[PDB]
Design a protein around this nucleic acid. Structure first.
Ligand SMILES: [Mg+2]
Ligand SMILES: [Mg+2]
Ligand SMILES: [Mg+2]
Ligand SMILES: [Mg+2]
Ligand SMILES: [Mg+2]
Ligand SMILES: [Mg+2]
Ligand SMILES: [Mg+2]
Ligand SMILES: [Mg+2]
Ligand SMILES: [Mg+2]
Ligand SMILES: [Mg+2]
Ligand SMILES: [Mg+2]
Ligand SMILES: [Mg+2]
Ligand SMILES: [Mg+2]
Ligand SMILES: [Zn+2]
Lengths: 30, 49, 63, 70, 143, 67, 136, 183, 206, 145
RNA sequence: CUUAAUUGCGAUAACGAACGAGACCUUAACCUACUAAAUAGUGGUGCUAGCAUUUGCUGGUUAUCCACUUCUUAGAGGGACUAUCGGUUUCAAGCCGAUGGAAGUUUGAGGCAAUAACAGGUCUGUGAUGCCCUUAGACGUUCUGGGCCGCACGCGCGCUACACUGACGGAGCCAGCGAGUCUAACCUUGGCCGAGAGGUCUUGGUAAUCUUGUGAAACUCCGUCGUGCUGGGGAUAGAGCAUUGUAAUUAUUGCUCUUCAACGAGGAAUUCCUAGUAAGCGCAAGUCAUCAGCUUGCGUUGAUUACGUCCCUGCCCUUUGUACACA
């Protein structure tokens, strides 16, 4: 089967200061 | 001592905080983003690229 | 707008404060003992062909 | 509004005696030689398209290309 | 000479054979042609005034012929271009669905198409007739 | 650039300090030689671990070398 | 004897065999192209080569993906990687060797499955490499 | 669904350990799998804790009447030891004294907070060989981090260990640098 | 001229362009003559393209930038202004559009006069400047080969759309007598009205 | 079309009910230049008032505008549906109206001075000169005058 | 010297080492190969629809048969090593070409990440929180209503543009990335009412099956308006119909008609950028009861130019000076 990645793009910081850096976690099913 | 609060953000609360802030209503988990990454890897959500 | 020519031999180096201007050693076909360095704004490299407007008064390291 | 309303039979001769000596004329060239505007003559140049002394080239859209008979 | 509508390409087949249902007499238009716009995302009407749909119909019969059923939705998704939303960006607006509804109730009003089992509109045996009728006559005219 | 690390080379010198008899004089012929005699945990490392043993023997005919 | 034709997201599964004669693109034959400008682009897999006797062709090509241009390359490569693939285990070789020679002296992405693919978007930026205008 | 499902495999798998280093910590918890440090006080007074909340596992979580080489076990191994009271100077070297000759490559322990109320002590205690980093760390480390709540200024540990890649016990057999042959 | 069709409609007005006098897709491609020594090997012409849309890997490296036809490289030097960057098919339609306009005046075959219209086009010498910081001392250097093609194939659009802004005449309707002007060395064009001007700094700075 | 001849047929610009309507531009777009009628409006009125809009109001006559000047002075009669016109449901007589003339603002300041006549906040703001419609008057429309 | 790099050649009072970089890991490509399927895609048959009609054109056949692994997808793996040969090396380390070519900027793009820092941001994420302040006319929690958006004004990320490579109008019709409903209302085909907004009616779909070929847009083919601020422009502004929601007033949002403001390519400045890049285009997902001119991504279309230097702005390594060590 084709696998579908589950992606949750959330910004890396709790507050709203820094550079606007994001990061995508994956869930890889099969 | 209560009035209609059916939908919206006052409706949904964080599982770990009841924090109405930062909700992520994706995949039926319902936690805020401040909150999630702390409890991230233990769900099988990892980082590859 | 007059006439004359020369053309390329082999690259040596860059100049200009910004490193844009390049000058390099090239040669004239007829009477082949002809050679002196010369800067050209555009891109050159081994065996291209020059274009000027005067015959011979060369430039040197652009400060 | 500036020049060329719809009428001018005043020097209507240039309809045909236009196309040679500068081989090329086409769609906007209509407004070139101190003549017209472009809304009552945009459709003009198939009067001689169907008969005369001129030569076909193109069938684009937004365009035109034509020189006289050779 | 071995002819299919799927052997003559885009508006060759539709912007000329609309002459034929241009030519089928029965006016069949519910009283709003010259006075509509074909979709929500449009600022001025079609331009063939007493027409534009004597020619729109064929595009319906165009896509329906070639493969199986299409429907109400799948033909709002074509004529909906980029909308001048105002001073906001463009979008894929959705084309009209009501003119695309007696696009069919006035389409069998000459009988060319049928309806579909899977939910839709499948090309009819009489539909296969006429479009293979119309395409076999246009080529022996010009090259 | 194009310049291999020390684990590419310090291995490549430890090959032929006692294994002067062996090897070939080029890459394809030779690269299933390198899946052969180390516990290389990378298809791509021994891939390039032959790209450096290239010239150790390509200029075996132009002078033995360092160490 | 079958192949693919790939420029981008558009992959033209290229049927070829000694078949029927048509020049199809998902739909209708060479009839229905309609760039009508770049119409001449799929016109270089069989013109510096034999011009015809292809009533025994399988020139079905379905370009599902890409775009109008994405898929024009996809079918001339679909033909390339499938016409040259006819004379590979079906018919003589020294005309495959001697007209894929005529391809590559003019090669325009024929049997070259194009290595060039898009780049992901990097956050904090308009598209992939561009960024937001710097504020001070 | 299936997406909203395999998440719920894990997001149920998650809140558990929120409920585990809260209730079974003093009773010596290591990790769900139930990995543990101490293991009687998890059962209870022959029955006091075994079922005190399996009976609450249901009447909260929709059920019915009837259905030292790890850091997360070592970052609380002796997190008690601090809030009970010892020197934070030698106690920390004890744990990296401990695991290191347990055939283990590398270990590292930090304590962050107010030793004395200032811009706050952050001293660090290492020992051994700690690969970091690339992919070979996900394989070879364990690190835990537990907030320590003492009466004047919260502090916090960040323990790290590493598996001896030689006696690996699973997966890769050594560092991906590995080189060796015979003379 | 090999007159044959196969089982699909081939108007043979097409199987004619190349197993004949193999010309352009519609123009005599062989009397293709360069009018200058400034730019040979640096304008590509011959071999030809049928369509000026070879989407090849020609800017991958440094100086493969010009081994595709000058027909091609000027395709690209036009489609810009943001509104039409990208969008290559609005360009190559017009090049094979007005390539016809060139075989009109004194027929002279369009692409013969194209490289005749890189005679007077880019610069003979511009004058780069010296570091300093001040009066902008620019000591003159003569031109290199590829920037009397490249910035000649750019000094043909640097201000060539300024005669299409809120005015009437179409884009393609232009270049033939900019073409001949660059082939004739005129008084009114851009590409020669501004190389002479790129050398109002001409024989002053040596 | 083609050669249409004519010497003085066309009374270009010709006053369509107190509007200067110049002739060189087509009639459907010449009444853009008329109040209360826009690009769409003169496509309906000039289409069911049965005059082929391939042409110019300048050329036409004093006649074929005459029945445009009525089929929209009261479009409620012959084949003009009930939303192509400014003032539906009038708002005081129900009788559907349209505002055309040097009168659009003489009706677009009829109510822009009636809830400006009864203490409605939705008028107060274009009275004070600000963008009424819940728009951020902070960053934009600052000069405007 | 050289490299993206304390990357290496070399030189050497160093020698041999470990961390960092690298290796490692994810992804976008190619395999005509083994391993593969009405959930994928293609021929083909008991046969069925239409043009020409000595057999092809184009299909149709949701519990009608037969085939295939080329496409797709992806299990196991293969393959790029700068391989080979030139140009320049010095002795090399290597850098600029060329052919092979699926693949030449580390193959492209990323994930990780040393030793140390800094009163940097978050108590407005945490049932993380020391200590204080507070704890019954409460700063706790709630109910009602308003406010964060309020405009002589400056500024920052932006969207719609100034129009003839354009706008309007048929129309050809091309993606890829992706999400979706049990104590329930999520993804809506397909009907049908509608001017559209929307209504209504079923229906498929817990999802390679249905929505979905998300029949996207730029686009583009065919027409149209001939350069005013004119329709370019859609701002302000009036009137009417809907959709969410106890609740849309200070327009949530949409569709229709009238309105039609600058703006005529933007000063001093300033940003981003080297290849499927810039840029244009629209699409999903997050947000979401609702609402994009936002965000994270995505593919369609695809250039110019350099494949270089310190001139500016900055950073790193040496040398040097110091009365600084709070540096
Ligand atoms: Mg709260
Ligand atoms: Mg359009
Ligand atoms: Mg508009
Ligand atoms: Mg600034
Ligand atoms: Mg400032
Ligand atoms: Mg690394
Ligand atoms: Mg701080
Ligand atoms: Mg705010
Ligand atoms: Mg501003
Ligand atoms: Mg619906
Ligand atoms: Mg407006
Ligand atoms: Mg935002
Ligand atoms: Mg500097
Ligand atoms: Zn939370």
């Amino acid at each position: 089967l084709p696998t579908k990645v589950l992606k949750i793009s959330t910004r890396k910081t709790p507050n709203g200061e820094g550079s606007k850096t994001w990061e995508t976690y994956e869930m890889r099913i099969h | 001592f209560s009035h209609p609060r059916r939908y919206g953000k006052g409706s949904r609360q964080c599982r770990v905080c009841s924090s109405h802030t930062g909700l992520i209503r994706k995949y039926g988990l319902n936690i805020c983003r401040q909150c999630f990454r702390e409890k991230a890897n233990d769900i099988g959500f990892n980082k590859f690229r | 707008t007059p006439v004359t020519l020369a053309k390329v031999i082999k690259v040596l180096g860059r100049t200009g404060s910004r490193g844009g201007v390049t000058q390099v050693r090239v040669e004239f076909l007829e009477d082949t003992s002809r050679t002196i360095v010369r800067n050209v704004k555009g891109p050159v490299r081994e065996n291209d062909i020059l274009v000027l407007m005067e015959s011979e008064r060369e430039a040197r390291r652009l400060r | 509004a500036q020049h060329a309303v719809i009428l001018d039979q005043e020097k209507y001769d240039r309809i045909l005696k236009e196309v040679p000596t500068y081989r090329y004329v086409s769609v906007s060239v209509l407004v070139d030689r101190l003549k017209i505007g472009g809304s009552l003559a945009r459709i003009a140049l198939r009067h001689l398209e169907k008969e005369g002394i001129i030569k076909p080239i193109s069938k684009h859209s937004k365009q035109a290309i034509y020189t006289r008979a050779t | 000479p071995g002819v299919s509508v799927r052997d003559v390409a885009a508006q060759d087949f539709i912007n000329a054979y609309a002459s034929f249902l241009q030519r089928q007499g029965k006016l069949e238009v519910p009283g709003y042609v010259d006075i509509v716009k074909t979709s929500s995302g449009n600022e001025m009407p079609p331009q063939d005034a007493e027409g534009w749909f004597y020619k729109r119909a064929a595009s319906v019969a165009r896509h329906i012929y070639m493969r199986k059923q299409v429907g109400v939705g799948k033909l709002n998704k074509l004529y909906g271009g980029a909308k001048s939303r105002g001073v906001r960006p463009y979008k894929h607006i959705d084309a009209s669905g009501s003119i695309n509804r007696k696009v069919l109730q006035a389409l069998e009003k000459i009988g060319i198409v049928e309806i579909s089992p899977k939910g839709g509109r499948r090309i009819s045996e009489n539909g296969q007739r006429d479009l293979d009728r119309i395409a076999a006559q246009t080529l022996e005219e010009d090259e | 650039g194009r310049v291999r690390t020390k684990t590419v080379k310090r291995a490549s010198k430890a090959l032929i300090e006692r294994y002067y008899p062996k090897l070939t004089l080029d890459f394809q012929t030779n690269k299933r030689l390198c899946d052969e005699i180390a516990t290389i945990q990378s298809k791509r490392l021994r891939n390039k671990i032959a790209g450096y043993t290239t010239h150790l023997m390509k200029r075996i005919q132009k002078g033995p070398v360092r160490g | 004897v079958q192949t693919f034709g790939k420029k981008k997201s558009a992959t033209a599964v290229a049927h070829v065999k000694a078949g029927k004669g048509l020049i199809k693109v998902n739909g209708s034959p060479i009839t229905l192209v309609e760039p009508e400008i770049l119409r001449f682009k799929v016109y270089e897999p069989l013109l510096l080569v034999g011009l015809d006797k292809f009533s025994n062709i399988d020139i079905r090509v379905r370009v599902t993906g890409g775009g109008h241009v994405s898929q024009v390359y996809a079918i001339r490569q679909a033909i390339a990687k499938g016409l040259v693939a006819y004379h590979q285990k079906y018919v003589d070789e020294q005309s495959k060797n001697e007209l894929k020679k005529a391809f590559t002296s003019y090669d325009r992405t024929l049997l070259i499955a194009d290595s060039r693919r898009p780049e992901p978007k990097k956050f904090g930026g308009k598209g992939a490499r561009s960024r937001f205008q710097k504020s001070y | 669904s299936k997406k909203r499902k395999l998440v719920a495999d894990g997001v149920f798998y998650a809140e558990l350990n929120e409920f585990f280093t809260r209730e079974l910590a003093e009773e010596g918890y290591s990790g769900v799998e139930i990995r543990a440090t101490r293991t009687q006080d998890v059962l209870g007074e022959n029955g006091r804790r075994i079922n005190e909340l399996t009976l609450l596992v249901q009447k909260r979580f929709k059920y019915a009447p009837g259905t030292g080489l790890s850091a997360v076990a070592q970052a609380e191994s002796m997190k008690f030891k601090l809030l009970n009271g010892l020197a934070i100077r030698r106690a920390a070297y004890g744990v990296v004294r401990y695991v290191m000759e347990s055939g283990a490559k590398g270990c590292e322990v930090v304590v962050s907070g107010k030793l004395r109320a200032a811009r706050a002590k952050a001293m660090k205690f290492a020992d051994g060989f700690l690969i970091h980093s690339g992919q070979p760390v996900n394989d070879f480390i364990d690190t835990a981090t537990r907030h320590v709540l003492m009466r004047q200024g919260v502090l916090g540990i960040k323990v790290k260990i590493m598996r001896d890649p030689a006696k690996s016990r699973t997966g890769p057999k050594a560092l991906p640098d590995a080189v060796t042959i015979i003379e | 001229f090999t007159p044959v069709v196969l089982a699909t409609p081939i108007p043979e007005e097409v199987q004619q362009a190349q197993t004949e006098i193999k010309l352009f897709n519609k123009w005599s491609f062989e009397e293709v003559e360069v009018k200058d020594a400034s730019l040979v090997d640096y304008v590509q012409v011959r071999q030809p393209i049928f369509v000026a849309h070879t989407a090849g890997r020609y800017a991958n490296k440094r100086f493969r930038k010009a081994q595709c036809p000058i027909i091609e490289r000027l395709t690209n030097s036009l489609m810009m202004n943001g509104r039409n960057n990208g969008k290559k098919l609005k360009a190559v339609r017009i090049i094979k559009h007005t390539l016809d306009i060139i075989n009109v005046l004194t027929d002279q075959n369009p692409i013969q006069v194209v490289v005749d219209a890189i005679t007077n086009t880019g610069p003979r010498e511009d004058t780069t400047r010296v570091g300093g910081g001040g009066a902008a001392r620019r000591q003159a250097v003569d031109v290199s080969p590829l920037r009397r093609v490249n910035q000649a194939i750019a000094l043909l659009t640097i201000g060539a759309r300024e005669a299409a802004f809120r005015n009437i005449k179409t884009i393609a309707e232009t270049l033939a007598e900019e073409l001949i002007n660059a082939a004739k060395g005129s008084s009114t064009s851009y590409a020669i009205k501004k190389k002479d001007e790129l050398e109002r700094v001409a024989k002053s700075n040596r | 079309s083609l050669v249409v001849q004519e010497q003085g047929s066309f009374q270009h610009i010709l006053r369509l009910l107190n509007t200067n309507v110049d002739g060189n531009i087509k009639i459907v777009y010449a009444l853009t230049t008329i109040k209360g009628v826009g690009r769409r409006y003169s496509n309906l009125v000039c289409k069911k008032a049965d005059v082929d809009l391939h042409k110019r109001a300048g050329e036409l006559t004093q006649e074929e505008l005459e029945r445009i000047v009525q089929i929209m002075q009261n479009p409620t009669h012959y084949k003009i549906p009930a939303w192509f016109l400014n003032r539906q449901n009038d708002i005081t007589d129900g009788k559907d109206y349209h505002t055309l003339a040097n009168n659009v603002e003489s009706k677009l300041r009829d109510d822009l001075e009636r809830l400006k006549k009864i203490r409605a906040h939705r008028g107060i703001r274009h009275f004070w000169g600000l963008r009424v419609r819940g728009q951020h008057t902070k960053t934009t429309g600052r000069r405007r005058a």
